[PDB]
Design a protein around this ligand. Structure first.
Ligand SMILES: CO[C@H]1O[C@H](CO[C@H]2O[C@H](CO)[C@@H](O[C@H]3O[C@H](CO)[C@@H](O)[C@@H]3O[C@@H]3O[C@H](CO)[C@@H](O)[C@@H]3O)[C@@H]2O)[C@@H](O)[C@@H]1O
Lengths: 214, 220
């Protein structure tokens, strides 16, 4: 089969900048190379077909180039709506093959997170479990760490971290860190603290509560 | 106008088969090749095969001969794919997509997620995320829903039945010890909450559950 290789798996670029996404074929495929965009909700959209031809509702910012073996999709001036994963596709003849996609992120001005901490609900507690949640809202860049302290001691176990997709409108990220314990474990301690370290400040943003409600 | 409507998420045991569907509308079903494409997590896209509903001629990637079976029913304008001898490697989102004319895959289905597992369906537990008693302060409040211990994917979350969409942040699901969890948060003005019903709606298609969690102030 014809192996399609994308230059990079992920790309970050500022609004207005020129962005190129590369694809390479293991054999000469002439002009039979297509580009699709997949959005986070999994929706797939043809953008460029036959190397260089724009499809339905595709902005003139998009262009395509190809040598038969090396291809690229170019965005002249990156826009907010261009976030997504871009896949190449050769369709010379069966079997059709695809590149593994290039995820395109918007590079943004740095933004400090807004941090919130959530004690377990009474509802969860009465059922025997306890989750404490730390939520870091609207920051950039994506890279961020959350340290949990229980009664002043670091806890790494039972911690689950997850990010949102980059915000389609303002390019920020949010994330939550969930610390899971039994109710009995939870009630054996008083102080619950999450510390958010981000490049926007050399000091950690600290949010805490005391189970004694004071 | 052209639409490809695929069937819903499926949970299937290893060794069994699944048959998924792709209802086509807005064009002449019998005059276009319908192709099927497989997307495994972090593993690109893979072409499976194609069918021409007009004469039911089929093409397959060699790999999928005897593994995937493509059919079409003209009276129903529906294309089908049956994948047998299911393994973990068959856990994927499967797309149906229309080829031609003089363009490639111009129209795509929304995808059918297949989960291959021996584990039974488990509905999520939902818990409210409410600011602590000693929290001070702001003109906006951040509220949430913790969605825990469900299987298989996906779960969708919305707020006030979809009426609340601004300031909504839903993190990606995480797989831990055989079960998924996620959380959704919303920031609303201090005069909307606790003043108004802020409900998170949690849907889990696999268990056919549609849950609500009312977000209410803590007990004083
Ligand atoms: C321009 O490159 C882009 O187009 C190709 C896809 O093009 C192919 O699409 C249809 C097949 O689905 C095929 O056109 C045939 O179907 C129509 C009849 O239904 C006819 O116009 C045509 O029929 C035959 O195909 C031969 C074309 O060589 C022609 O001799 C005979 O009439 C067209 O090839 C995408 O891959 C590229 O992106």
């Amino acid at each position: 089969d014809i192996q399609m290789t994308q230059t990079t798996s992920s790309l970050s670029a500022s609004l207005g900048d020129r962005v190129t996404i590369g694809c390479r074929a293991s054999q000469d495929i002439g002009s039979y190379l297509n580009w699709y965009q997949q959005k986070p909700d999994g929706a797939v959209r043809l953008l460029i077909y036959y190397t260089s031809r724009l499809h339905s509702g595709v902005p003139s910012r998009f262009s395509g180039s190809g040598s038969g073996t090396h291809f690229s999709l170019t965005i002249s001036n990156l826009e907010q709506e261009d976030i997504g994963t871009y896949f190449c596709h050769q369709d010379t003849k069966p079997p059709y093959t695809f590149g593994s996609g290039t995820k395109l992120e918007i590079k943004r001005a740095d933004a400090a997170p807004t941090v919130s901490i959530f004690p377990p609900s009474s509802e969860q507690l009465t059922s025997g479990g306890a989750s404490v949640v730390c939520f870091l809202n609207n920051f950039y860049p994506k890279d961020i760490n959350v340290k949990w302290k229980i009664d002043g001691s670091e806890r790494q176990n039972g911690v689950l971290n997850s990010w949102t997709d980059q915000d389609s409108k303002d390019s920020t990220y949010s994330m939550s860190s969930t610390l899971t314990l039994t109710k009995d474990e939870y009630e054996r301690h008083n102080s619950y603290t999450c510390e958010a370290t981000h490049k926007t400040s050399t000091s950690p943003i600290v949010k805490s509560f005391n189970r004694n409600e004071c | 106008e052209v639409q490809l409507q695929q069937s819903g998420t499926v949970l299937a045991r290893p060794g069994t088969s699944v048959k998924m569907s792709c209802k086509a509308s807005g064009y002449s079903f019998t005059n276009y090749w319908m192709h099927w494409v497989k997307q495994r997590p972090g593993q690109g896209l893979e072409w499976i095969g194609s069918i021409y509903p007009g004469n039911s001629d089929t093409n397959y990637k060699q790999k999928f001969k005897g593994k995937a079976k493509l059919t079409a029913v003209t009276s129903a304008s529906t294309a089908y794919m049956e994948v047998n001898s299911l393994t973990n490697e068959d856990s994927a989102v499967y797309y149906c997509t229309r080829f031609g004319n003089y363009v490639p895959f111009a129209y795509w289905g929304q995808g059918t997620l297949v989960t291959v597992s021996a584990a039974t369906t488990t509905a999520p537990s939902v818990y409210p995320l409410v600011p602590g008693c000693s929290d001070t302060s702001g003109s906006s409040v951040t509220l949430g829903c913790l969605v825990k211990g469900y299987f298989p994917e996906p779960v969708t979350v919305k707020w006030n039945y979809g009426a609340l969409s601004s300031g909504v942040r839903t993190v990606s699901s995480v797989l831990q010890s055989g079960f998924y969890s996620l959380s959704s948060l919303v920031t609303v003005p201090s005069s909307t909450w606790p003043s108004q019903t802020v409900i998170c709606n949690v849907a889990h298609p696999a268990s056919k559950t549609e849950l609500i969690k009312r977000i209410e102030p803590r007990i004083p």
